[PDB]
Amino acid sequence: GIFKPEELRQALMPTLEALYRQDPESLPFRQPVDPQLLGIPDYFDIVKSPMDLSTIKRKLDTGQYQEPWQYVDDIWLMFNNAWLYNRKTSRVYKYCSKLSEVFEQEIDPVMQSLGYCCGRKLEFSPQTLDPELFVECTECGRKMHQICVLHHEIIWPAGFVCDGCLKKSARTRKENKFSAKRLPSTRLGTFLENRVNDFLRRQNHPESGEVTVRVVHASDKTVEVKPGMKARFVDSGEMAESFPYRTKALFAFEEIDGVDLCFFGMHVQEYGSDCPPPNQRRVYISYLDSVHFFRPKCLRTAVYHEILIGYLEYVKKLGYTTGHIWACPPSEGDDYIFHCHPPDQKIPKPKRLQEWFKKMLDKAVSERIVHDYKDIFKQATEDSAKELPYFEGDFWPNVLEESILYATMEKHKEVFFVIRLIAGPAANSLPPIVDPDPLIPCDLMDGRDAFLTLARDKHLEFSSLRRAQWSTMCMLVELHTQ
Numbered sequence: 370g371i372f373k374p375e376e377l378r379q380a381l382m383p384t385l386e387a388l389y390r391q392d393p394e395s396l397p398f399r400q401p402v403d404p405q406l407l408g409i410p411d412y413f414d415i416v417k418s419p420m421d422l423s424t425i426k427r428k429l430d431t432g433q434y435q436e437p438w439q440y441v442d443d444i445w446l447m448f449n450n451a452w453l454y455n456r457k458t459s460r461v462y463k464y465c466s467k468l469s470e471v472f473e474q475e476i477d478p479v480m481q482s483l484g485y486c487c488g489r490k491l492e493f494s495p496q497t498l499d500p501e502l503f504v505e506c507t508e509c510g511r512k513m514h515q516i517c518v519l520h521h522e523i524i525w526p527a528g529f530v531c532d533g534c535l536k537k538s539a540r541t542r543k544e545n546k547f548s549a550k551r552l553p554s555t556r557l558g559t560f561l562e563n564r565v566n567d568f569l570r571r572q573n574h575p576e577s578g579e580v581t582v583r584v585v586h587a588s589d590k591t592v593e594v595k596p597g598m599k600a601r602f603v604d605s606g607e608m609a610e611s612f613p614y615r616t617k618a619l620f621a622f623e624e625i626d627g628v629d630l631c632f633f634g635m636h637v638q639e640y641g642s643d644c645p646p647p648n649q650r651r652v653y654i655s656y657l658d659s660v661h662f663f664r665p666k667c668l669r670t671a672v673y674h675e676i677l678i679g680y681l682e683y684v685k686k687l688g689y690t691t692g693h694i695w696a697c698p699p700s701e702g703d704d705y706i707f708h709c710h711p712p713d714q715k716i717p718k719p720k721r722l723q724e725w726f727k728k729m730l731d732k733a734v735s736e737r738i739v740h741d742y743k744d745i746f747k748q749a750t751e752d753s754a755k756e757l758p759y760f761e762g763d764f765w766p767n768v769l770e771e772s773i774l775y776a777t778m779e780k781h782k783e784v785f786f787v788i789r790l791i792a793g794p795a796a797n798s799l800p801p802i803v804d805p806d807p808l809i810p811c812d813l814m815d816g817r818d819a820f821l822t823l824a825r826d827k828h829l830e831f832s833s834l835r836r837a838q839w840s841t842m843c844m845l846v847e848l849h850t851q
């Protein structure tokens with residue numbers, strides 16, 4: 370026992386009385402359902418654990434609840450039975466939804482007054498609902514959402530100690546060494562975060578946190594020319610068989626309410642100077658993703674721009690001549706790089722996404738980082754299908770197979786950006802591209818599949834700030850302990 374029964378009763382009874390006072394919405398919930406009198410003889414075939422307000426009151430009054438989650442559980446048992454048994458359009462269903470809304474408001478400040486994280490009954494997103502897990506304070510015995518208190522067994526193996534118990538004993542929580550800042554740095558990561566933090570300091574907005582950019586994957590790969598064009602151009606001995614590239618994964622994190630938040634992810638393909646044409650000295654953005662919790666809101670878009678402009682600046686200086694972006698929005702539900710985006714984070718329509726890349730590239734011109742950029746139509750004109758750069762997982766390889774030319778580039782022109790970084794003479798007499806960062810092997814971050822799979826297995830959602838904080842903590846433990 371943590372509480373005197375009278376203490377628990379005096380704290381919770383007012384939240385019960387809040388529900389009882391709601392009339393008519395409490396009328397179906399005041400007494401045990403009597404299926405005979407109500408003419409619903411199938412009630413007990415569907416509802417196996419009936420619960421009502423008079424029962425909960427008698428449990429409070431007789432000291433039956435040992436800790437308040439038991440009370441919250443009986444409340445949500447009572448709501449769930451009504452939502453299970455009654456139609457969505459029914460009066461009782463709608464009354465039950467009203468009481469759940471009044472309960473949500475009342476329980477929170479009460480559960481926080483008794484030293485709990487919150488009073489919420491929490492389930493994961495559909496991907497039947499998996500319940501959120503609880504951890505137990507080793508000092509006081511209170512149970513709390515694992516996600517509310519960000520308790521990870523690998524970071525803190527001796528167990529969870531709540532803020533209230535730590536303050537009581539004049540201790541602070543042992544530092545999280547599995548942080549984004551303590552991930553191994555790269556010249557690329559440093560260059561990007563230095564550009565982002567220089568920009569944020571110049572803005573001098575009080576809400577902004579430090580930003581971290583970490584390259585977390587770097588491996589050498591090859592894209593093989595698919596059979597239906599190997600037959601035409603490769604087998605003859607005209608086009609090269611396979612194009613070697615470096616695949617890199619990077620993430621940007623922000624300090625929000627004292628902890629790491631992963632808010633941006635990018636995969637790139639880097640076809641260097643020892644790469645046969647038409648891929649020679651090109652970079653390709655495989656995929657971009659974000660989680661909209663960057664603070665402040667008013668700088669979110671600029672920060673994304675600073676990372677992307679930063680990346681183009683950096684590869685230019687190494688000797689890449691051209692950047693390529695397939696400006697195509699995702700369509701994998703609430704997933705892409707990040708599992709389970711916030712439900713109010715809208716995927717942009719093709720037009721808005723094109724206007725967003727356009728805006729980013731106009732700033733890059735103003736800075737003399739991008740010399741010029743155009744749609745693949747106007748750059749194919751200004752330059753056979755053998756001469757198009759051939760990138761792993763891109764639209765263009767797949768569409769030339771559907772055929773086996775100029776027809777297709779016109780109808781889908783605005784979705785393909787070609788970005789001249791080094792144009793004209795300067796491009797001709799360049800040193801070899803040498804990447805000064807080591808290879809970073811990491812199977813979890815090798816393409817976007819493996820991390821989506823882990824996030825599905827382990828309910829690493831990005832659907833709210835609190836869940837995105839827990840998922841950021843969990844991904845960083847994985848990245849440090851590989």
Ligand SMILES: COc1ccc(NC(=O)CN(C)C(=O)C2(c3ccccc3)CCCC2)cc1
Nearest residue numbers: 657658659699702703704705710714716717725
């Ligand atoms: C509801 O489920 C979702 C939600 C979002 C995504 N992903 C994107 O929006 C992925 N994207 C297109 C983005 O992040 C940018 C974006 C977003 C919005 C406007 C303009 C640009 C911001 C960083 C790069 C591009 C996927 C599923």
Ligand SMILES: [Zn+2]
Nearest residue numbers: 486487514517
């Ligand atoms: Zn909680």
Ligand SMILES: [Zn+2]
Nearest residue numbers: 506509531534
């Ligand atoms: Zn405690």
